[PDB]
Amino acid sequence: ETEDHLESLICKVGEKSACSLESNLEGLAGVLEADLPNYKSKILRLLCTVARLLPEKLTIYTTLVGLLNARNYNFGGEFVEAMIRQLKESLKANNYNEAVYLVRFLSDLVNCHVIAAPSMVAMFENFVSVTQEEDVPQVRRDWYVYAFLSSLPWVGKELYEKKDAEMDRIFANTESYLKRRQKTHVPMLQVWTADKPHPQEEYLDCLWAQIQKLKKDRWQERHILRPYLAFDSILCEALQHNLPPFTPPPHTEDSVYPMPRVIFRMFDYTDDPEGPVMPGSHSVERFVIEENLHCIIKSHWKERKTCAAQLVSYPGKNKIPLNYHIVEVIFAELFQLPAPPHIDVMYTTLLIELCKLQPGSLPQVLAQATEMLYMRLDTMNTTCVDRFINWFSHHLSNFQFRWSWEDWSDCLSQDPESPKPKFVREVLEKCMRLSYHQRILDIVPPTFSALCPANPTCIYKYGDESSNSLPGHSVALCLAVAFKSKATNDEIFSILKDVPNPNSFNPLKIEVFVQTLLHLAAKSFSHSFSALAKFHEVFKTLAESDEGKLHVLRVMFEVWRNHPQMIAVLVDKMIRTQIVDCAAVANWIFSSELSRDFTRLFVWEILHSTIRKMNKHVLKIQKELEEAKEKLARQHKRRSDRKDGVLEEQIERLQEKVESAQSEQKNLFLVIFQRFIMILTEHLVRCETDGTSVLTPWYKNCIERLQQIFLQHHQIIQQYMVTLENLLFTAELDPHILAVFQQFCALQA
Amino acid sequence: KINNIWGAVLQEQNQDAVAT
Amino acid sequence: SHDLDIF
Amino acid sequence: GLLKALRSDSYVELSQYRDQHFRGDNEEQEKLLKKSCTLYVGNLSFYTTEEQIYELFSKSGDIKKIIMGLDKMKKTACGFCFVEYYSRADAENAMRYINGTRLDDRIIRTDWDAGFKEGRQYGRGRSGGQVRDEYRQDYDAGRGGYGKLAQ
Ligand SMILES: CN1CN([C@@H]2O[C@H](COP(=O)(O)OP(=O)(O)OP(=O)(O)O)[C@@H](O)[C@H]2O)c2nc(N)[nH]c(=O)c21
């Protein structure tokens, strides 16, 4: 009860209260001082926890520490020792986000007269000197400089007015380092490749510019809340502590550092001619606002209602257009590469809740943002485009599919493959997936009918009278009647063993059997699932060869080439039921039969779903092997303190299974990359021979899909890096394709 | 021109919810 | 629907 | 360790609905619910086909199986479904984000379920449909019309 009471007290401070923040801080300080002699370690741990897991209230939690230090020097010293221990553990653990929040806490604790400025200056000197280390990854240096620069907006004035000489030396070293950094990764991370109206500059470059503007402004931001300013009278006399000499942990092979990111900028002060002047793109206030909003979203990503409530009630020293900032931060998280911090549907639901909470103003801002995003579609990345399409379709579904389509009439005259008409087509198709064709037709203007999708109806090649001359029509009719008569598998073999092979793989046989089966089971998903599961044996016996699986996939596409969702679901079931392996589907995606539909979003959602299925299967088998090994170890230790033989045998079998699963995963990724390389190389050679522009919508889509696969599965491709560089991505490769691989390598190096 | 289509949609949905 | 989803 | 305020997960908590025809005590039903992967999706329209339900619920993760709520005698939809995901995390995400989202202009309401057994897909209502459909009196086009009692 004591611990939970202390936790509730500490967390409560700064929320809805009838009293001011200073009064709450003083009360909490007193209370803690009362409970100091009996819960010193408990309080220390709780404070280090709120410091490490609640960055969005950072300054508040430092003022508390600034008061306790004024009351108990010993307590302050122990606290800073514990904070340096937590920092060293987070660094040895590879928890660099927590480590940077801790560094920010120490930096702002320097402002409360807890930590002496010279000691923090020395720590920052060590941080910067990390940049002078030899043969270390550039991500380490990047992060160590980032920590310092990100902490500067909170203690920069103090550090400069105390040690301006060493501060200038630090700044000179930081500039010398930043001038020689590598920016190879920026193109793979920019949401928009266009340099106007908002360049998507790297986070370190942005932050450096902001710090330079803050220094030119005599270190004055007018945004950050500093409750300890009102306590100056009590804090000036308080004794200051000296941090022990800090040496960053040495680089190790197993250490993993955060990958560089690119600031997502889409708004401008001109976009709100009525509200408060939005902070400039290079103002430190803007960076602090985005960081606080990101932390708020990351701290409440489970409770969408509470997340919306916290976002809407975000405090600031000076009034700002908080609606625009929230929308921008939400879109930045949604459109962030490689992947968003959380599932993509969370952002949609959070935006819906935000609109519900503030219907008077926010919906207009959302519509304006949508229109902006659409106007700048000519360069947005296709991954961000897919995320935008999904979110917008879900939004329209949640708002009676109402939108001012006429405002986008400019897209009706453009090439249908242009990002704008393509985006409209995909949005309409997704809206249809959540509705019926007729409704989608009824809602769009008639002039947009050329974009509306196609009715999702089965295409039975042997249904029309003109099909009587097709080979296998009689066999098709016999199979149809047998299916209608609940025939058994052996009967179906008897009716099928009479199909004339065109020349252990009969294409006509598979084609007829699958066309008939799908056609008779083409009134509901459940029907198809039952027809696939019941006749599983026939499927596995007719499609023994990988070529047979490819033929099955091709026939399934031909039957349902108008119902992409059905195609997707069917392929999923076929790969889970083991009718087709993932390699066959991967080969099918790049097959010529999909060239006309190669750029359509459903083929890539299918490919990604198959990759995810393979990854999950491998992870499950590995986890089972780990559990079996743990059980073996526990049993052996308990016995030491037949069965063993058979268990060890099992373990061996599981290990072989894990090896085979990893081999299949590797083969899947290798085949995918080979097919990407082949298509891009042949396209580039043909374009060069023709002397035409290499930048075409198809090329952009393919290259950015390759980038999407690399970004999505870097975690696994890190293992194959060696073979990828030795076999696939070689020097002889075309520079355009090799550029993607170089960017991916530089992403974490 | 402030596109307020979704403000109208939210107003209609709230009216329907009140009617229900 | 016998449990075929082994993969 | 970790702050309990952040651990608060109000959307992934058990509801007050306990199965009335379950074969066992409440305790084992709760045990199953804490590890189940099946969600009962209610407040659906009769016309809602399962393709759109799959398209909506496949946004939280890979779906394993969908069972529509058939009528006891007419064998037609009654406005409820069972969605069985492949992993617990996917079901939790669906409850945290899909719960309370519109579908066919209808506010769907997903809840945890103790799993699927044969005969559960038929509405317990003695009229064939759903008990709520038998007790409600307000008109609803998506739910056929007036309640069975009204007719
Ligand atoms: C309200 N329902 C209904 N339902 C399931 O829907 C099917 C038909 O139930 P029903 O006709 O609504 O009857 P009943 O469950 O008695 O409803 P109620 O208790 O609301 O009167 C059964 O498989 C039942 O378990 C539910 N299943 C779960 N998990 N949670 C719920 O809240 C509900």
Give a structural overview:
- The complex is a heterotetramer, with 1 copy of chain A (749 residues), 2 copies of chain B and 1 copy of chain D (151 residues).
- Chain A is built from 32 helices and no strands.
- Chain A is mostly helical.
- Chain A has 3 domains: 263 residues, Serine Threonine Protein Phosphatase 5, Tetratricopeptide repeat; 170 residues, Serine Threonine Protein Phosphatase 5, Tetratricopeptide repeat (Alpha Horseshoe), CATH 1.25.40; 281 residues, Serine Threonine Protein Phosphatase 5, Tetratricopeptide repeat (Alpha Horseshoe), CATH 1.25.40.
- The radius of gyration of chain A is 31 Å and the shape is globular.
- The relative contact order of chain A is 0.05.
- By secondary structure, chain B is mostly helical.
- Chain B has 1 helix and no strands.
- Chain D is α+β, with helices and mostly antiparallel strands and 151 residues long.
- In chain D, the strands form 2 sheets. A 4-stranded antiparallel β-sheet of chain D has the order 2-3-1-6.
- In chain D, a hairpin with a 2-residue loop joins strand 4 and strand 5.
- The radius of gyration of chain D is 16 Å and the shape is globular.
- Chains A and D meet through helix 1, helix 3, helix 15, helix 17 and helix 23 of A and helix 1, helix 3, strand 2, helix 4 and strand 4 of D.
- 7N-methyl-8-hydroguanosine-5'-triphosphate binds next to strand 1, strand 6 and helix 5 of chain D.
